Structure 1
Amino acid sequence: SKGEELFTGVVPILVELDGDVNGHKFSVRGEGEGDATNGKLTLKFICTTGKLPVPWPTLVTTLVLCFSRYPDHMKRHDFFKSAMPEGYVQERTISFKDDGTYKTRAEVKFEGDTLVNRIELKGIDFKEDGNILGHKLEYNFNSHNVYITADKQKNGIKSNFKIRHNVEDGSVQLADHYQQNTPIGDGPVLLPDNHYLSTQSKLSKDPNEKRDHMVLLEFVTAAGITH
């Protein structure tokens, strides 16, 4: 694909989220860089409206899978890069078991030389005592495989998966993701055979930063295709 050539090296990233959870309005802004050659992603996020009303880990999936390393033999199954530079829409429903639901719509696309992920998030039916509004989740993010399938009808891809968030008390908060991606342009895109992305993520803090923030290191690498 032509989009793919855009990802030949380190690409600078902008992320912008406008959120509303149970009425609590907040905004997140993130900056950094991605490298699809090595499947590597480094981002620093700041809650620009003050304290974040939800826990940072819950926003990880929402806050650029075009930066997944697709191995050479899988290059033809890389929807995400193929939709660039005009980009793609990534919509999700995230149901937190026994708790509220995020609904998200994002556009991931190049603006100038910068890959931008611009997100609207609405959160509803959250329990004030729950693990989310109650900030009961550990500051981390498990390794995880997410399965990608083609959606020929929508000319894109879809994915269902469960994210397991560790709770303080040693239990697990499940977050059921239903995901759909569709091209923003009307050019041709790569529709993949079934495969999955292998994710590892490291959450940390900038010791110099006073604002409520997350430093995120991510590796994502496609797999599951025979040869």
Structure 2
Amino acid sequence: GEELFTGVVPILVELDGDVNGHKFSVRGEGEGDATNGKLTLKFICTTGKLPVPWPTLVTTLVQCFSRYPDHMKRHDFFKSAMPEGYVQERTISFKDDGTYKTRAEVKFEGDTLVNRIELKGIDFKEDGNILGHKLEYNFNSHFVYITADKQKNGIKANFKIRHNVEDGSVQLADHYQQNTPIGDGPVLLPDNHYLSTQSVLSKDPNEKRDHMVLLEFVTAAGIT
């Protein structure tokens, strides 16, 4: 799949969500560039006002675009499954609050790398940090710790996302993640390694809808 990730690649993101009964959709459009490890995307709430904070959806809203050092190019599970793609499933547990269960299909449709997601959020506390919109419109940098799954012919990741809250606290969102290939093949099963992740959130001034502009930089490390 590498050759598919030389140069820039256009991206489409689709997310249908339901959190404590509130239903919504998100559409994301942009460009990735795995040589650099760089995404630039604009997501729009296609259905109205987003019932949850934009930052809680960042990890859900294309890890195939991780810049992999040449001395690790063989541990790049994500790229090795293209163009056919992968299923990405997570349990995201917000500390002291609800849980997101997500299922996404990531794959090429022609030229465009597509992310189509269903998200279901349960047990969210009314006027918690999430439903009570107390989270800052920013993001921190994280480590995403990956290991292979012999059995599923795939990988597992595990990381804790730290969301800044308006009172200066930190809402942890614990992430367990499971990826399995779609198409038929053996795929690249990595020894233990991580992704170093960095992200910046911003707004487009001439956009009258509720939206999120995202810049992300990701590179893989942990192997010498």
TM-score range, shorter chain: over 0.9
Distance in structure 1 (CA, Å) of the matches to 2:134 and 2:127: 9
Equivalent residue number for residue 69 of structure 1: 67
Q: How many residues align?
A: 224
TM-score by length of 1: 0.98
Structure 2: 5+ residue stretches without partners = none
Distance in structure 2 (CA, Å) of the matches to 1:75 and 1:131: 39
Matched position secondary structure for 1:76 = coil
Aligned residues: CA RMSD: 0.5
- Cα deviation, residue 188, structure 1: 2.3
Q: Aligned to 1:57, which of 55, 58, 68? A: 55
- Cα deviation, residue 189, structure 1: 0.8
TM-score by length of 2: 0.99
- Cα deviation, residue 86, structure 1: 0.4
Matched position secondary structure for 1:38 = coil
Question: Residues 102-122 of structure 1: CA distance to partner in whole angstroms, max 9, x if unpaired?
Answer: 000000000010000000000
The sequence identity of aligned pairs, in percent, is 98
Equivalent residue number for residue 156 of structure 2: 158
- Cα deviation, residue 138, structure 1: 0.4
Question: Residues 182-208 of structure 1: CA distance to partner in whole angstroms, max 9, x if unpaired?
Answer: 000121211111110001100000000
- Cα deviation, residue 9, structure 1: 0.9
Distance in structure 2 (CA, Å) of the matches to 1:20 and 1:116: 21
Distance in structure 2 (CA, Å) of the matches to 1:156 and 1:211: 38
- Cα deviation, residue 161, structure 1: 1.0
Question: Residues 7-66 of structure 1: CA distance to partner in whole angstroms, max 9, x if unpaired?
Answer: 011000000000000000000000001000000000000000000011000000000000
Equivalent residue number for residue 43 of structure 1: 41
Matched position secondary structure for 1:58 = helix
Question: Residues 70-94 of structure 1: CA distance to partner in whole angstroms, max 9, x if unpaired?
Answer: 0000000000000000000000000
Distance in structure 1 (CA, Å) of the matches to 2:203 and 2:144: 26
Matched position secondary structure for 1:57 = helix
Structure 1: 5+ residue stretches without partners = none
Question: Residues 137-169 of structure 1: CA distance to partner in whole angstroms, max 9, x if unpaired?
Answer: 000110111111001110010011111100000
Check if 1:223 corresponds to 2:221: yes
Distance in structure 2 (CA, Å) of the matches to 1:160 and 1:66: 17
Equivalent residue number for residue 204 of structure 1: 202
Q: Which runs of 4+ in 1 moved over 3 A?
A: none
